[PDB]
Design an enzyme around this catalytic site. Structure first.
Site, PDB file in Angstrom:
ATOM      1  N   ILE A 104       0.785  -1.220   0.000  1.00 14.91           N
ATOM      2  CA  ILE A 104       0.000   0.000   0.000  1.00 14.91           C
ATOM      3  C   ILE A 104       0.821   1.275   0.000  1.00 14.91           C
ATOM      4  O   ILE A 104       1.866   1.373   0.644  1.00 14.91           O
ATOM      5  CB  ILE A 104      -0.937   0.007   1.213  1.00 14.91           C
ATOM      6  N   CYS A 105       0.319   2.253  -0.737  1.00 10.83           N
ATOM      7  CA  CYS A 105       0.818   3.601  -0.657  1.00 10.83           C
ATOM      8  C   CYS A 105       0.022   4.362   0.411  1.00 10.83           C
ATOM      9  O   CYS A 105      -1.066   4.880   0.152  1.00 10.83           O
ATOM     10  CB  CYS A 105       0.693   4.279  -2.029  1.00 10.83           C
TER      11      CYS A 105
END
Length: 147
Positions: free
Chosen positions: A84-85
């Site tokens: 995830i960003c």
């Protein structure tokens, strides 16, 4: 010395596991641990107890939690390895953010859907564009693999 910080981040999750967020010692290693982040609240993928496996290579102080979706999930910040960003883990991270914190923030990508940061060439697209791809599919996975 990262695992011992993760002692809070990860294990604080085990100290008091409420909802839409739970991790802790899985292999008993603080670098191979399982967080259940959920749709449950008001989410496009409501019902979806998702699965995040997190690993650390001796990071601390700077501990970037590569917290990755075990399952499949459509969202601009999740690329096809569940990675995830998340600002608080890429931009806003400090030794003061528990996973007890980040798990809810990641939950917030299922829960809060942000229309900002594109990690994946397509998945960011299908989100902010192929509205079908994002809701129907990640919520379907919610139904099938999570729930």
């Amino acid at each position: 010395m990262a695992l011992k910080r993760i002692h809070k981040e990860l294990n604080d999750l085990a100290r008091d596991p409420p909802a839409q967020c739970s991790a802790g010692p899985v292999g008993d290693d603080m670098f191979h641990w399982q967080a259940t982040i959920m749709g449950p609240n008001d989410s496009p993928y409501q019902g979806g107890v998702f699965f995040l496996t997190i690993h650390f290579p001796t990071d601390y102080p700077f501990k970037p939690p590569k917290v990755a979706f075990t399952t499949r999930i459509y969202h601009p910040n999740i690329n096809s390895n569940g990675s995830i960003c998340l600002d608080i883990l890429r931009s806003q991270w400090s030794p003061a953010l528990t996973i007890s914190k980040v798990l809810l923030s990641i939950c917030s990508l299922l829960c809060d859907p942000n229309p900002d940061d594109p990690l994946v060439p397509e998945i960011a697209r299908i989100y902010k564009t192929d509205r079908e791809k994002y809701n129907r599919i990640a919520r379907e996975w919610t139904q099938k693999y999570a729930m």
